[PDB]
Design a protein around this ligand. Sequence first.
Ligand code: E8H
Ligand code: MG
Ligand code: ZN
Length: 329
Amino acid sequence: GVKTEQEDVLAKELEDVNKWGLHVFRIAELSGNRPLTVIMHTIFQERDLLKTFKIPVDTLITYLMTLEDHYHADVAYHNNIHAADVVQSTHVLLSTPALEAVFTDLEILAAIFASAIHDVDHPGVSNQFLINTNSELALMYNDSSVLENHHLAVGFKLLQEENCDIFQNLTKKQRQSLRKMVIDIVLATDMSKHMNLLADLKTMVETKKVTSSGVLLLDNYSDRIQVLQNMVHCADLSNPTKPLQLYRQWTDRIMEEFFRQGDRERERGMEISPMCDKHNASVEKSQVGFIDYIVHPLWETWADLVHPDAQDILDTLEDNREWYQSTIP
Ligand SMILES: COc1ccc(C2=NN(C3CCN(C(=O)CN4C(=O)CCC4=O)CC3)C(=O)[C@@H]3CC=CC[C@H]23)cc1OC
Ligand SMILES: [Mg+2]
Ligand SMILES: [Zn+2]
């Protein structure tokens, strides 16, 4: 009933689970490529979600290992380590002081579970690639948020495997509420939704109320779900806000993925996608573009919403932006 030495070293790294910049890759190595399972289990125990939702612990572990196993290890970016990172980053964003006591335990469970499933069974190519290749997935989802619809369907279907139904003790009301929130959240991770989500988040910041404290008032579903959607979307787009050692690893992985899709697009005479030609795409300029056009406008607006809680994050992002800029020859 005492840990192995490797389990102990893992446990000590997981003491950082409430911090931005957790050594997620080290967790992946130390857990035997189970970062998603160990991070999720840590979070669920820390937030007391097993007791609140009467989730049997063997069921939770069984589902999480099954979920993690449906992430592709042969995909460089959209794998279980990315899922783990998004979960952990959501977990940190949920604890921001501006949001203290705002969300219910079911909303928290929704954001975390959504984060965990949000890229499951990702094949490592884009929606447009799937549509253009006449792929089964694209056909199934009548070309609309093909990947995101699939991540949802798989995340939910896996609950039906042996001893996997982590929601077995929720009421039907709880489950229907949870399910809707999870679907709303995952579907908002499709980048085709980014401009409208951001536009809505800016509107909310313009007309923002607070309960004196400095804490946000969110008194209808539209607003509550929009904040959760944008929060998970920020987590999904959090790579350039992390310390540079982490960010570069993410960049390597996204470029490997993109370059592999670019290889398959070139071979079939297809129009090669943005940043996916390994001959004609500069990594550093791509990252500066990503930050300027997508990541900084989102995070700046998030930092407004939760001011001043996200200042250090936004600083890191701006530092990384300058680092990448300064390395352009
Ligand atoms: C760490 O590094 C990255 C991590 C994730 C992504 C994602 N990117 N994307 C879209 C691809 C096409 N996009 C663009 O090229 C947009 N854009 C401009 O218009 C100017 C320059 C620029 O970047 C939008 C984002 C994804 O869809 C991935 C899946 C989900 C979330 C983000 C991921 C990109 C990264 O490095 C560029
Ligand atoms: Mg995705
Ligand atoms: Zn993702």
